[PDB]
Amino acid sequence: ILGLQLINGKNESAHISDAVGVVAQAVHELLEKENITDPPRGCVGNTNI
């Protein structure tokens, strides 16, 4: 069988470092413009996007 797999894709313990790397570097530009909102507070209290 000429199968197929992936490498460095199952390293979930090491995946979060790249996973947090992109988002943490993305909030830098997120909080760099006008009218930057706030994430919804609670569940029942918030009612819309």
Binding site: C43, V44, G45, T47, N48
Partner: protein
């Protein structure tokens, strides 16, 4: 089989309450437990909690959901309850109206509203009636374009009518600095009829580029699906006059009417099982213990829940979970920036008030008389609805 009519927002619950209690046929145990919880179910916690205490309190085996707000994905979370549990849930109006593309294999969901494929066929029926055989398609990366174009392409391919399809555009505003990437291709459009598939927010933007190029005004007629229209009251004042769109009927098919037929569908389908089962399915009266509550699966109900006819009109749902024969209405944007109703589409029949297009001076009438080889009239072709070729 208890039916819980759930409606949220700013609507009339008493109209739903009075209509639901008036059961037309008592031959089946409708037993509609109409809680009619008016609490805003926008938050997931509210809706998920009330569902499994509704099943706990009244031992119901059916729910119908109604909503007033947009709630673009309140059906997405609603489908999760249907998939995890086995109790059928049928949408009525609002955030459950839009058709979900794909659901779970065991999804107990049936929405009210035509799918994208149905919306693609009705626009062609408009085009067939008015003989605008030449057309072009503009689309985006939004999902369903691979199906919207395919439905158009399949209908066009190998047809008696001499359709003319060209200039399929598959670019939108998602790409950065796309202002120069969409003007070059938009200059390649030459057909008087352009079929558009986009999002309401980018629909205004995509026309702004078209207005700059000049593909607007008279001589060009564009057609858009229901989701592009978004809301009849919300006119973004950017869409040109003559934007003809097709959407589900929000006026005639009223909320008390929707529950009347909607509550009938689940009752007659479930009672059909009791004829051949003699044992009403009883999922656990909770939103937990799904591992042990799913043993008594009632997927046989789903297999025939779709095929249901009530009061003559067949309200059957497709296997994917969209209405087979919906009551679509054709809406047109007049010169006053207000959506204007035109005609009604049902039973594969397109009947509309305007027998001729109100376009007007590039539109000049001509009076002729049927005499001699000078002018010859024989008949119209009813096989496809189009007049003829070379006539």
């Amino acid at each position: 089989i208890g039916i819980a009519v759930i409606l949220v927002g700013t609507s009339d619950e008493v109209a739903i309450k009075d209509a639901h209690e008036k059961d037309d046929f008592h031959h089946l145990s409708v037993v509609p437990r109409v809680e009619l919880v008016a609490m805003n179910e926008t938050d997931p916690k509210s809706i998920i909690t009330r569902i499994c205490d509704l099943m706990s309190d009244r031992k119901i085996q059916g729910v119908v959901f109604a909503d007033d707000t947009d709630q673009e994905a309140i059906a997405q979370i609603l489908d999760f309850i249907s998939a995890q549990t086995l109790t059928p849930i049928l949408g009525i109006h609002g955030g459950s109206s839009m058709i979900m593309a794909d659901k779970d294999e065991s999804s107990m969901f049936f929405q009210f509203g035509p799918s994208i494929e149905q919306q693609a066929s009705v626009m062609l029926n408009i085009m067939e009636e008015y003989d605008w055989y030449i057309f072009s398609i503009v689309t985006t990366y939004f999902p369903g374009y691979q199906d919207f174009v395919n439905k158009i392409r399949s209908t066009i391919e190998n047809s008696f009518v001499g359709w003319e399809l060209e200039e399929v555009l598959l670019l939108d505003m998602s790409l950065d600095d796309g202002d120069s990437k969409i003007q070059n291709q938009l200059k390649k459009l030459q057909s008087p009829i352009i079929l558009l598939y986009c999002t309401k927010e980018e629909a205004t933007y995509i026309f702004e580029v078209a207005n700059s190029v000049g593909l607007t005004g008279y001589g060009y007629t564009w057609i858009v699906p229901s989701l592009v229209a978004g809301d009849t009251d919300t006119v973004p004042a950017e869409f040109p006059t003559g934007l003809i769109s097709v959407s589900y009927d929000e006026w005639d098919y009223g909320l008390p009417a929707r529950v009347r037929d909607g509550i009938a569908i689940i009752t007659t389908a479930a009672s059909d099982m009791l004829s051949e089962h003699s044992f009403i399915p009883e999922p656990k009266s909770s939103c937990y213990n799904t591992h042990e509550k799913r043993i008594y699966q009632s997927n046989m109900l789903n297999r025939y829940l779709i095929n249901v006819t009530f009061e003559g009109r067949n309200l059957s749902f497709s296997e994917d979970g969209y209405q087979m024969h919906p009551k679509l209405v054709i809406i047109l944007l007049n010169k006053e920036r207000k959506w204007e109703r035109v005609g009604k589409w049902k039973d594969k029949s397109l009947q509309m008030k305007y027998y001729v297009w109100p376009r007007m001076d590039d539109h000049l009438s001509i009076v002729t008389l049927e005499e001699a080889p000078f002018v010859i009239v024989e008949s119209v072709d009813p096989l496809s609805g189009t007049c003829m070729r070379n006539t």
